[PDB]
Each structure stands twice: as structure tokens, then as C-alpha cells.
Amino acid sequence: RGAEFTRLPVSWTVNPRDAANARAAWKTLSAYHRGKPKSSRKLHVVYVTFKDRPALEGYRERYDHILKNIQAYYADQMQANGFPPLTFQLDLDERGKLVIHDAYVDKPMSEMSVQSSGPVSREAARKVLASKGIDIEKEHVLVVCQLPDGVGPYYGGGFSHQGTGWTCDQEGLDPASFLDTEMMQGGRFKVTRGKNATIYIGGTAHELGHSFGLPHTGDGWNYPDAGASLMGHGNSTYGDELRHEGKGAYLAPTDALKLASVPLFNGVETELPADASFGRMLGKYVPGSFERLEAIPVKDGLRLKGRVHLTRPAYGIVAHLDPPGGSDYDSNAVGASLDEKGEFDLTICRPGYKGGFIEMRVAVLNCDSTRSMITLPVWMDARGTKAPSLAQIVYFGDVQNLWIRGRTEEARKALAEVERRHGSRSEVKEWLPVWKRALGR
Amino acid sequence: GAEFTRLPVSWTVNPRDAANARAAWKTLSAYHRGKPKSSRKLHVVYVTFKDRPALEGYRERYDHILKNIQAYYADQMQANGFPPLTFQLDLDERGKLVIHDAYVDKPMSEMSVQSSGPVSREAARKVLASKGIDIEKEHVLVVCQLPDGVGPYYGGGFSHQGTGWTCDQEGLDPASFLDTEMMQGGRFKVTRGKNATIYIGGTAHELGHSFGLPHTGDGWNYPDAGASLMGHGNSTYGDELRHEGKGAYLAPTDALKLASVPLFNGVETELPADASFGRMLGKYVPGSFERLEAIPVKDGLRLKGRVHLTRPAYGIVAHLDPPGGSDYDSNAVGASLDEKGEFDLTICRPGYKGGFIEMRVAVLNCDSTRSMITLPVWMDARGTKAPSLAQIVYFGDVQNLWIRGRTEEARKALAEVERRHGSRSEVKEWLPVWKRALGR
Ligand code: NA
Ligand SMILES: [Zn+2]
Ligand SMILES: [Zn+2]
């Protein structure tokens, strides 16, 4: 109900199973938080100007609207998914307005480039934050540069306890522009002024999600009337409902699950484990293993049943489908709850997929904000043929059992043994390339 | 021509539009019989700046770009039922695109989105004049070595003169259409192929504007043909090479308009003395109708009428403009014109709930100009005839004066219906929409 920053409505209804999974996740996380110190983390804002690039007019009031819009959006989307209205807290002054730290870089735009705008702007943010007693390497920071397109950075990266977002200011940029239907003039993108603000501010929400540790997650068959996933193509649809263009952008339940363990969102200062490590995808990862893991083929999808070997508290599980040759934008995800013994059961589909072999990512969300992730080769079709899945049990049973237990080198040896013993058989030789690919992620 | 990633044809024209195209070309061919041939070419100018040197391979890359757009227009004109008409390029002894190099002795810091356009065209005029070419009598594509947010992406002109504006980028080439790798680090999260689609499809879109084409969106009669190039097709040009969709197609109503452009048909027809610019792109002349009746059908109207031909015409185009929408939201239908001026077309807008909608009727003359009138019409899903019948009893004199171009008399007659029967329910809703049409 905050019209001062053009608060976005909720234009989708969560599926009942995801809301039930959200409640079970928050119940588990709340028990984990009992007795742990509270978090005072805030999302800090730095405004970077340059030698021939002074601060734009009203940037303090306009970005007070922008961040409050993103803050309300995340809270409202968290609440729509079944969680409490969790969101990041801002630094407010005595008047309740957004505190923005101003930084300057003594370099002209001619001396800047697409590859240097990022690090140079963050370097200026480090200095101005340290002067105020804030360590940039231990907080989440949004760096706003007064740079144009083709020079300035639109980027985001981080994890649960540290992250950095990058965006660029523009004259009159404000969430109030979301309603404008007038066309922009003279630009390569033949698009309205309202969508242009959607790209800017919706992009900022997309980069901030990246800074919290969220990779890309596209739309799925289970949400055909919810708009575009914010961490997918939703960055370009954020606020489209205010122009009656569509359903806008929604926070995917699998992304809501991951953020529920972020201290910036839940307010609890949990400690990261010692074995946390960065991976190919955004986030912090720890080793994990399963007691059993089977993907059963169904019509246009898979039914994933398994039992996690829980050596640490976990609150949920997320299954991804990654089509070969596609980017992370093309993946779809399904979430599920975990019982105390570690059993889970979910169904993930990709209707119309003709490629047959597809990669599946199974992520276990731990209460310490980290994740354990494994990549499994699976076969899928419209009919739901069981023949490839049966060859995976008969020939590749030892490979899977070792792989889901994290024994990569032993699984490779067992994979080499079936290739040398039965590699000439047609039903075996087609599983070898997708198994070798899965064993290297 | 795979050397420049020639685009395929990903749509099939409706049979009536192809039949309309053949009848239009037959009429235009008779008009061209005995007229001098045209040597017009679309000239290309590359503008560099003080701290903005020419990008690598810009000569070979824009040889691919212009040949791609040239082949696209030819293939889309042929798909619509016309001969493979397109613009001709200036080719050297090796058959490569001739590019005129222009320089502006100003740094990029002194350029802006609003000033890059006119400053670039001025530099193009000088280098073209040095070669004996008058920019105000030809079609020119101005390419600036400028980034986004500084450089111009614009287009404007008519049948006998036009200017297109675009900006170069590192590695911009139609061969990039197939790339599915993500760009990264940009405000627009799009693949490298999508980025090239926006650049080159934009150029094709601006060139269409330079030929005299306004915006024309998609319509119900082509739901599986892709996006209209003069609508949102600028962002779908070449999408089929990534299996993203059907790409961009040239709307039959736009193909009709281009058939009278000397750059496309090769005949140097003379512009009439009464040609004038209008609210929309193109050259316009006064026109009138002997009769004009819109018959309501399901989700649309059937338009029958007879143009009062005071000059040779080869076709007619009807547009529907929903209230509150931009030019991107209009849909258009083309039709052929007989020697007496008779025409018959059907235009629909399924799902439109607004009831009252504006219709633009454009007559395409053989001298490259158009006559256009704006009519208020009513439309619904059922196809109810009641509002159109009240439109016949009242406002009868208003339409008769309006289709004869007598604006002031139509306004006076409109005030008479408001004073005599303005309280009647079947009359009072036509009054506001008629004043809007009489002022458009
Ligand atoms: Na065996
Ligand atoms: Zn991203
Ligand atoms: Zn345009």
C-alpha cells in the first residue's frame, strides 16, 4: 500500500504444494534459528560519479523509490510463495529515507570500458564504505554508476553472506514511470518509456537476486499463468501489469526457498560452515550424498524419489532440468519438502522436449545457507518410455550408487568398466557421453 | 546467397493478398509503360568521430548487412505476389558494397541521442556532394560509429527521398544471427543472435520508414507469419535461424505501398505538384469517394465503396486504430482497385471490446502518393447492425460531405444532428467519435 514508490501488485497465485513446502521450510528454519544471534545486515547503496559524469538530478529521492519498490516486491513475493514477508532491510536516516553513500572516480568516460566499469566502480564503493565503518566484503551492496549503455555495468554476483549488484542511473528513472505508455524516441529498442523503466529497475531486482546467491531459473509448465520468473526472463517484465502488458514478474518458489536461508532476508546471523566453497553456479556449496536416488520416467517428465543422507539440517530440495545446448535461462525447477529421515518425492516435467537426454540438477538446501548439488543424466520423452531408465539400472547401477555418494573417481572407474565390457551395445553407448558430461560438473 | 546469411521466407501469403498484389502490379505496370527508367540506389555513409575510429571489418560486415536487407525485401516482395522488387546498391568492380567515409571533428562527449542524427546527416551530405550526389533527392543509410545512448537509430522519408540511421557495433554481421551465446553484462539480457537481430532488423525497420512506411502491427489474418517488419518485427528479424519463432515478415499492405516507390520498381515517375507531408510518413494528396459503406461482420467490418479517381490508383489499404493505442497496435488489410474505383475488403479485430474504433482508408495512387480519410466505425463480436443503421439515418449528410473532403461543411452538418437529435440514445454516442474523426 505504498504508492510513494509505485508498489507492484501480486499477479499470480502460488501452487498449493509449493505453499505447503514453504511452510515446512520456514518451520524447519525457525527451529534452526532458535538461540542464534540476530542479524543487523542491510543492503547498502553507493552512487558512483565520474570526472565528466556528475550525479543525476534527484537520484536520492528516485532511488529511495527504486529500492523501496524492490524491497516491497521481494517481501510481497515472499509472502505470496507461503513464507513470511521476508526482504532485505535498508539503511534509513532520521527522516526514514534511503542513505546513499556518494563516491567519485577521477577518470573520464573515455578512460572507461565495459570490462573496467565493474571493478572500478566497486573500488570506489569500498573506499566510501570503509570511511563509514562498513566492510564491502562482508555486506550486500548495490553499486549505482552514472554511466551510459555500452560502458556501464549491469551485473550481479554473490552468495548468502556477501554480494554485489551493479546498475546504471538514467535521467528521471523512477518506478512511477512504470505506468507510462509513451514510446521512447531515437533508440535501438523500439519500446515504451514504461518498459524502459521496467528493464532498468526490473534488471536491478534481477541483479540483486544474483547477489544473494540465486542462479538463473526460467519458467516451467507448472506455472503457465504466473508471468515470467524474475530470475529468468522476468527482469524484462517486472511491473508489466501496470501497463496491462501481461502478468509481470514473479519470484519462483524454488528461488523463494533458497532466499529463506539468506541472513539478509530472515534476520538471523547464522554462521557459514568451514567447508563452504564457490562453484560454477552462484552460491556456496558443501559436499552431500544420497542413500538412494531414482528418476522414474513419466509422460513428458520425471518422478524423482530419493532419500538424502542428512549429515546437517536441511529444509528443502530443488530439482532442475537443463536442456542441452541451452543457457541457464532455459531451465525449469520444482521444489519439494524433506522429512526428518531425508525422504522426498517430486515430479518435474518439460512438455514438448524432443531431445531425449537431458541433465537434471538435484540441490539440497541446508539450514546453514549452503547447498549440496549433484548432476544426473536422465532420459525423457512424451510417451514415458522405460527402456533407457532400465539400462541405467542394469548397466549403470554401480556408477550412480558411487556418484550419488560423492565418489567421483570411483564412479569414473566404474563408468570405464561398463564402457570396456559393454560399450559396443547400442543401449549402453548412448549413455556414456551424457554420463561423462555429468561426472565433470 | 549464404555468404551474407540470406534470410528464408517463413510465411505464406494469403491467396487474396497475392491476387491483390498481381492486380496492383498490372495497374502499376500500365502506368510505367513508356516512362523513363530509374537509376536510384540506396547509398551508404559511414560516419566516424574524433575519438571514434571505424570499427574493424566494417566494410565487409556492412556489405553483408545491406545485401541481407536487400535480399530480404526482394524475397518478401516476391512472397507477397510482386516481382522480387528491392533497392539497388552501389557496387564496386569486385561486386562489394561501396561505403562513403565521413568524419566529424568532434569527440563523442559532444554528441547526444538528439544531436547525433542531424550532425551525421550533415557529414553525409558533404561526402555525397563531393561525388555529385544530392542527399535531398536520394535514399541514404547513415551509419554512425557511436554506442547506444549516444548514437541515432531513426528513419524518415518518402518515395523519392529518405534517410535511415543506425549505429555500428563490434562484429555486427548477419552471420551472428545463429549465435545463441549470451551477451552478459548488459542491461538487455539477450543472446548475441538476438542482439544482431535488433541491430539489423532495426536497420531494415528504419529503411522502411525512409521509404515512406508508417508503423503497421500484426493482424488476425496472419497469426502464424511472424511479426510485421514495420511493427514489432524489428526485434524478430531473423528469429527463425535460432528456432525462436517465425521471425519478421513484410505486411502485404506495406508491400503494396512499396510497389510505387521508384527505388523498388525501377521506374522514375514524377511526383505531382500537390504532394504534401502529413501526420504520418509519406506524401499525401487530397482524395474523395463517390460512396463508402462499412457493413458489420463478426469481429470486423466489410468495406465496400468506390473511389472518385482523379488520378490513377492501384490499391486501397484500411487500418484499424484502437483508442488509446500507439501506431504499433493497428492492423491493416489491402485490396485491389478496379478502373471505376470499386473495392471490397474485410478487416477484423477479434476480442476488441471497446465498441467504437477509428478506421483509416488510404488510396494508393500510381504517382507514389496516397489519399487518406479517417472514419468512425462500430465493431463487436456478434456483428450487430443496429449502430451502423442509426449511422445511416442520421449523420447521412455528414458522411457525404466528409468523404468529399468538405470538412467545414461536415462540421456544420454535425452540429445540426447534435441540435436536432442529440438527445436520442442511438445518436448521442456517435457525436464524440465523429468530432474526433473530423479533426484527425
Ligand atoms: Na550387468
Ligand atoms: Zn542474470
Ligand atoms: Zn519505427
Side-chain angles (χ1 to χ4, degrees), chain A residues 2-3 5-6 8-16 18-26 28-37 39-41 43-50 52-55 58-60 62-93 96-106 108 110-114 116-119 121-122 124-131 133-137 139-146 148-170 172-181 183-184 186-192 194-246 248-270 272-279 281-298 300-339 342 344-353 355-382 384-385 387-420 422-423 425-428 430-440, chain B residues 1-2 4-25 27-32 34-40 42-49 51-59 61-92 95 97-107 109-112 115-118 120-125 127-130 132-134 136 138-169 171-177 179-180 182-183 185-191 193-223 225-243 245 247-269 271-276 278 280-292 294 296-297 299-303 305-337 341-352 354-374 376-381 383-384 386-390 392-407 409-411 413-415 417 419 421-427 429-439:
Chain A
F5 43 88
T6 325
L8 265 61
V10 175
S11 311
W12 69 295
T13 287
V14 71
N15 288 337
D18 294 308
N21 294 342
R23 279 171 247 124
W26 193 238
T28 308
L29 276 165
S30 298
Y32 191 69
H33 295 155
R34 268 181 306 129
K36 297 206 157 59
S39 146
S40 55
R41 275 152 189 277
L43 175 62
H44 300 290
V45 195
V46 176
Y47 197 92
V48 174
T49 56
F50 298 92
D52 57 341
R53 286 263 144 178
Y59 71 102
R60 284 193 208 261
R62 281 178 309 110
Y63 271 91
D64 180 272
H65 291 4
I66 284 178
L67 271 91
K68 278 172 153 93
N69 191 269
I70 307 307
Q71 182 188 51
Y73 174 80
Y74 269 94
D76 292 322
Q77 296 287 323
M78 273 304 163
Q79 181 182 82
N81 265 300
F83 292 97
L86 311 173
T87 190
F88 52 93
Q89 294 318 111
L90 298 168
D91 202 30
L92 308 179
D93 53 4
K97 291 312 227 217
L98 175 66
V99 193
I100 305 169
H101 306 84
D102 270 277
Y104 167 75
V105 158
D106 201 15
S110 69
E111 282 177 6
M112 298 283 78
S113 63
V114 202
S116 87
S117 289
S121 74
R122 196 180 187 268
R126 177 222 323 124
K127 267 119 46 163
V128 70
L129 286 176
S131 59
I134 300 162
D135 197 342
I136 182 158
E137 310 290 337
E139 309 275 354
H140 282 90
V141 202
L142 171 67
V143 182
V144 181
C145 324
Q146 207 285 96
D149 291 7
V151 199
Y154 300 86
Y155 200 58
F159 60 101
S160 57
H161 287 62
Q162 185 271 311
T164 311
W166 280 275
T167 206
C168 288
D169 199 351
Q170 188 184 257
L173 187 42
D174 195 275
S177 302
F178 284 159
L179 281 57
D180 206 329
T181 186
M183 288 303 165
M184 281 225 168
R188 186 170 39 111
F189 312 93
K190 303 320 195 164
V191 80
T192 89
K195 172 98 151 214
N196 185 248
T198 275
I199 306 321
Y200 264 102
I201 312 173
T204 286
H206 179 95
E207 315 283 9
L208 283 170
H210 280 309
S211 68
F212 309 144
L214 289 182
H216 280 149
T217 289
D219 300 294
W221 93 111
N222 50 318
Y223 281 105
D225 305 329
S229 157
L230 169 83
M231 289 316 310
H233 305 321
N235 68 283
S236 83
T237 62
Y238 181 91
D240 273 9
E241 328 102 287
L242 305 179
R243 284 179 310 277
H244 303 61
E245 266 179 63
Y250 81 103
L251 185 81
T254 53
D255 290 323
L257 280 164
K258 286 183 268 294
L259 297 173
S261 50
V262 166
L264 192 67
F265 275 71
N266 54 41
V268 184
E269 188 64 27
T270 66
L272 264 205
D275 58 337
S277 317
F278 288 113
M281 280 180 108
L282 281 162
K284 277 274 177 184
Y285 297 86
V286 303
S289 63
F290 298 80
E291 301 203 351
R292 39 160 186 98
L293 194 59
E294 212 199 329
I296 288 117
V298 305
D300 264 329
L302 292 163
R303 203 203 172 161
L304 182 60
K305 313 192 62 157
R307 190 190 270 214
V308 187
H309 189 77
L310 294 160
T311 46
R312 74 180 76 209
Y315 65 89
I317 203 153
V318 177
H320 290 258
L321 280 181
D322 309 301
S327 57
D328 41 31
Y329 276 125
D330 306 88
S331 66
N332 70 292
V334 166
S337 38
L338 263 192
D339 69 359
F344 61 96
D345 188 1
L346 59 96
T347 291
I348 178 158
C349 298
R350 195 168 186 86
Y353 176 72
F357 274 120
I358 192 160
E359 294 212 305
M360 175 160 83
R361 281 184 289 119
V362 194
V364 173
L365 319 179
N366 306 312
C367 289
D368 55 20
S369 307
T370 70
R371 298 169 232 157
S372 40
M373 208 183 241
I374 198 189
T375 299
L376 275 192
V378 282
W379 199 88
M380 174 193 283
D381 64 358
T385 316
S389 70
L390 283 180
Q392 172 96 307
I393 294 158
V394 171
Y395 297 106
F396 300 88
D398 281 341
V399 175
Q400 167 142 332
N401 283 148
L402 298 167
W403 174 232
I404 70 170
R405 267 153 195 90
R407 301 146 83 175
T408 307
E409 197 174 1
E410 283 149 78
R412 283 189 164 120
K413 270 140 190 204
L415 176 64
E417 181 95 284
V418 51
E419 179 180 58
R420 104 177 79 249
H422 309 312
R425 232 148 295 175
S426 189
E427 85 199 274
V428 181
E430 57 175 15
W431 271 103
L432 300 169
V434 291
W435 255 117
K436 281 176 199 200
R437 200 193 326 280
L439 287 199
Chain B
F4 53 85
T5 326
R6 184 180 179 175
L7 288 202
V9 182
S10 313
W11 70 296
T12 298
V13 76
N14 284 335
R16 181 176 331 270
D17 284 321
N20 290 339
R22 277 180 243 106
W25 190 240
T27 301
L28 278 166
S29 285
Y31 191 72
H32 296 146
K35 302 257 220 291
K37 289 334 181 103
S38 172
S39 64
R40 284 162 187 269
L42 169 60
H43 304 275
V44 183
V45 180
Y46 198 91
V47 181
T48 43
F49 301 84
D51 63 330
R52 305 291 303 183
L55 299 184
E56 176 71 26
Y58 78 100
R59 259 153 202 285
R61 284 184 300 106
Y62 272 93
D63 175 88
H64 291 162
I65 292 179
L66 265 304
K67 269 157 193 197
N68 188 291
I69 305 187
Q70 177 194 57
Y72 174 80
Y73 272 95
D75 299 333
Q76 295 280 330
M77 286 294 287
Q78 185 185 308
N80 269 289
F82 292 101
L85 313 168
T86 185
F87 50 88
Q88 304 299 130
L89 300 162
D90 199 18
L91 300 194
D92 52 34
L97 173 80
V98 165
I99 286 168
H100 296 93
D101 290 320
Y103 177 65
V104 162
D105 206 7
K106 309 279 172 233
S109 56
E110 274 163 38
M111 293 295 131
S112 82
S115 54
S116 59
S120 271
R121 189 166 191 279
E122 186 58 34
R125 182 206 310 279
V127 309
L128 285 172
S130 288
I133 296 155
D134 191 4
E136 308 291 347
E138 317 272 353
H139 277 86
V140 181
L141 174 66
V142 181
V143 185
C144 310
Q145 202 299 272
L146 241 30
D148 265 293
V150 182
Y153 302 86
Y154 201 65
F158 54 99
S159 55
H160 290 61
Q161 177 269 323
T163 317
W165 276 277
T166 194
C167 297
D168 194 11
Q169 203 198 36
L172 193 38
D173 197 279
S176 289
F177 283 156
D179 199 346
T180 46
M182 285 288 329
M183 288 229 78
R187 185 164 44 96
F188 287 83
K189 309 308 191 161
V190 282
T191 64
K194 190 62 208 271
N195 181 69
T197 277
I198 297 168
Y199 263 105
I200 298 170
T203 307
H205 174 94
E206 313 284 8
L207 285 171
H209 281 311
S210 79
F211 305 147
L213 290 182
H215 280 149
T216 290
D218 298 288
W220 86 117
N221 53 316
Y222 284 106
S228 150
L229 170 66
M230 280 335 275
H232 296 307
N234 71 288
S235 56
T236 62
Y237 183 97
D239 270 3
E240 57 262 59
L241 296 180
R242 280 175 270 110
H243 293 93
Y249 83 106
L250 183 70
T253 61
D254 285 325
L256 277 166
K257 280 175 260 211
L258 295 176
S260 64
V261 169
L263 196 65
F264 275 69
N265 54 41
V267 195
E268 178 84 351
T269 63
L271 268 181
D274 54 346
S276 325
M280 285 172 110
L281 284 159
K283 285 303 191 183
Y284 290 94
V285 298
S288 69
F289 299 78
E290 286 180 21
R291 54 177 181 72
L292 201 43
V297 305
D299 274 304
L301 67 92
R302 170 136 173 219
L303 183 68
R306 184 176 281 206
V307 184
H308 190 67
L309 299 168
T310 57
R311 61 181 83 203
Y314 66 92
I316 192 158
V317 178
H319 304 256
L320 284 183
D321 303 328
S326 53
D327 42 4
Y328 288 96
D329 299 316
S330 74
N331 70 289
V333 173
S336 48
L337 264 179
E342 202 65 42
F343 60 90
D344 192 349
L345 70 100
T346 302
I347 184 156
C348 302
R349 216 176 161 83
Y352 176 67
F356 276 121
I357 193 159
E358 283 199 324
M359 175 163 80
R360 276 182 291 110
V361 184
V363 181
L364 318 171
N365 302 307
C366 295
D367 64 1
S368 298
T369 72
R370 304 166 217 150
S371 75
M372 221 187 48
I373 190 173
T374 307
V377 300
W378 203 84
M379 208 175 31
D380 62 355
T384 58
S388 94
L389 284 173
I392 281 186
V393 175
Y394 314 95
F395 313 88
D397 298 22
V398 181
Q399 190 232 45
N400 176 280
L401 300 154
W402 177 232
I403 68 181
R404 273 155 191 84
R406 291 152 84 182
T407 319
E409 291 174 84
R411 287 184 178 118
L414 181 53
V417 193
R419 169 195 82 82
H421 310 116
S423 39
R424 295 189 202 232
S425 307
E426 78 268 23
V427 181
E429 270 153 86
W430 282 104
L431 295 175
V433 283
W434 260 111
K435 319 217 191 61
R436 271 191 290 271
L438 290 201

